[PDB]
Design a protein that fits this description.
The structure is a homodimer.
Chain A (H helix, E strand, L loop, with lengths): L1 E5 L4 H12 L3 E4 L7 H11 L3 E4 L21 H21 L3 E7 L28 H13 L6 E6 L12 H7 L2 E2 L9 H13 L4 E4 L8 H11 L7 E2 L2 H7 L12 H6 L6 H11 L3
Parallel strand pairs in A: 1-2, 1-3, 3-4, 4-5, 5-7, 6-8
Bound molecules: NADP nicotinamide-adenine-dinucleotide phosphate (2 copies) and ligand AWU (2 copies).
One NADP nicotinamide-adenine-dinucleotide phosphate binds next to helix 1 and helix 3 of chain B.
Pfam family, one (chain B): RmlD_sub_bind
GO cellular component, one term (chain B): methionine adenosyltransferase complex
GO molecular function (chain B): methionine adenosyltransferase regulator activity
Chain lengths: ~290, ~290
């Protein structure tokens, strides 16, 4: 089939593009900006893709390798443009043309259920955002809600803290290896090497709706650094800091949660729990 | 004949003014119980009430400690900004469209800068023009809401008002406000006299007119010209101090939109709408 990819030069979009091409699919990198709704509709009307995917957003930039970038005066316009408006333009136009859209969103719109409390099973697909501590998370929360108005037309995948075996400035493990102090908190995370094939399968199948799109279960920064130490780097040591210490040195807070992945597990029962998956990733990693 | 109207923002300055007028015209007005951002509660209320027409007079434009849009520039208020100035209005657009019920959305023309210099080649920002003013968090979000309303061009009436004026003094009224300000940044602007423009808005909603409309009285008026007309007609001892654009920017949390709106589209439908200077004369004579 023919796959039109927005964000195909980005970290994730490049990775997905490569896998679609190894699978024998035709990939078209979108030339239109997602927020240029008239150019998007011209491109979609002309290319006539079988599938559209969105790997776009504004999550770092000059001076800031993190979502702290969006807290600067003058960046709200880039935040809403790339992290809400562009994705909504793709939803409206893909829906009009009856072309399945995969939107790669975020689960960094919730806070909590990550304390191993016996009565808490994690945030669901239907749950409203309850984390408002970064401008990124605020805007993405509304994008996530708005995507529920396209439940039969758009696949809304909530990834978090994405990890690759290959080291990359964007990869959660690369980042935490680089940080002087670690705020260790159990969290739902996405191993892209494991879950990109699932995402492609879902888009091939025209599956629609919202899915929490993390590996089952919780892992902490300390558990990940402990595996790197215990598998490869016996000398490895790090300093811990609290949520409050971290808040003081960043421009924004950070989302910490468990996502309930029962919905994804109903379709894809072989996705590894996050600790089995991280053990696998760390075992294969170069430094 | 007389109809049933569901009003979001029925207790607000503009909403309560429109409610009273629809009631004076012998309509049935229901004040909405649901928050516009509570999409499930909105869908319940619309499906229950089965209104002939829905109207939105909602937004977040002031709050504790800040009688202006400067309120939205505080850390932690982006969530209120997007919730009330974008997401709630989009919830109303999606749901009213689903139920094929006409929606009037009271938007803003404070999404553009320029064309107010009396240059003969500049006839003002049109309905199709994209936002070009990004100097307040209010204007940035409202600009995206305006663009999003264009995806509902057959189902929603999107009216861009600016600097609303009432005969009746009120803290929200542009004339009350500039009378209250020690220093005036005098700039020619498109402005909306609500006493003259609300009856046009109600007619449009009765006719189920949809699309975007610039919704200011035709032409420009400056702060200095309004205050001069108040002095000469009502208050001969009135005096004020003038200040620059950059001097204003030094005292406020954000910049302000200054523009001309092209009102040819409205004037084509309603040739009798008073030009701003004729209308300001009517207003000041009634004060
Ligand atoms: C998911 O989905 C997104 C992909 O992330 P990532 O980590 O792969 O980030 P990334 O490496 O920054 O990739 C993002 C891509 O999206 C593009 N983009 C941003 N806004 C766009 C718009 N309005 N129109 C078209 N392209 C746009 C960027 O291209 P430009 O550099 O050309 O802006 C970039 O190629 C993130 O939010 C991620 O978590
Ligand atoms: O159009 C708007 C009207 O302007 P105005 O000058 O009349 O301002 P206003 O006097 O501040 O009126 C705004 C009204 O909208 C309501 N509102 C705000 N967000 C809402 C939401 N998410 N759901 C339901 N109601 C909401 C407010 O009610 P609350 O006070 O109950 O928030 C208020 O009654 C531009 O602000
Ligand atoms: C596109 C979005 O990117 C996001 O990354 P974010 O910009 O929050 O990454 P970091 O600030 O590096 O934060 C990554 C992690 O590092 C922790 N940390 C940070 C700095 C420090 O000095 N020490 C620490 O321990 C921080 O608490 C967080 O757990 C998320 O992936 C989100 O899932 C995804 O949708
Ligand atoms: C809901 C939105 O409200 C808005 O009002 P805004 O909050 O910008 O009002 P003010 O800050 O009082 O500003 C009102 C006017 O006062 C001027 N001024 C301000 C302070 C000062 O000390 N001296 C001055 O001369 C300012 O430049 C502006 O022209 C707009 O109506 C917009 O059309 C509407 O959609």
């Amino acid at each position: 089939m023919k796959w039109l990819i927005f964000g195909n030069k980005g970290w994730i979009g490049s990775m997905v593009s490569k896998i679609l091409e190894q699978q024998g699919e035709q990939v078209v990198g979108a030339q239109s900006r997602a927020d240029d709704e008239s150019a998007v509709e011209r491109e979609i009307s002309e290319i006539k893709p079988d599938r559209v995917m969105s790997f776009i957003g504004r999550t770092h930039g000059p001076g800031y390798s993190t979502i702290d970038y969006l807290e600067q005066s003058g960046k709200l316009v880039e935040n809403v443009k790339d992290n809400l408006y562009g994705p909504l333009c793709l939803a409206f136009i893909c829906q009009k043309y009856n072309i399945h859209l995969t939107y790669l969103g975020t689960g960094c719109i919730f806070e909590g259920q990550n304390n191993f409390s016996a009565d808490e099973k994690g945030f669901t697909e239907n749950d409203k955002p309850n984390f408002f501590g970064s401008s990124y998370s605020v805007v993405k929360g509304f994008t996530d809600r708005l995507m529920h108005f396209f439940d039969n037309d758009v696949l809304n995948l909530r990834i978090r803290m994405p990890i690759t075996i290959e080291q990359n400035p964007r990869s959660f493990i690369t980042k935490i290896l680089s940080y002087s102090r670690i705020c260790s908190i159990p969290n739902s995370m996405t191993i892209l090497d494991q879950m990109i094939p699932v995402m492609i399968d879902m888009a091939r199948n025209k599956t629609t709706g919202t899915f929490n799109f993390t590996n089952p279960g919780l892992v902490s920064h300390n558990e990940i650094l402990s595996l790197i130490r215990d598998i490869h780097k016996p000398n490895l040591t790090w300093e811990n800091m609290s949520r409050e210490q971290q808040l003081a040195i960043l421009k924004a807070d950070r989302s910490n949660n468990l996502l309930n992945t029962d919905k994804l597990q109903s379709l894809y029962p072989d996705v590894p729990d996050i600790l089995t998956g991280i053990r696998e990733v760390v075992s294969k990693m170069k430094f």
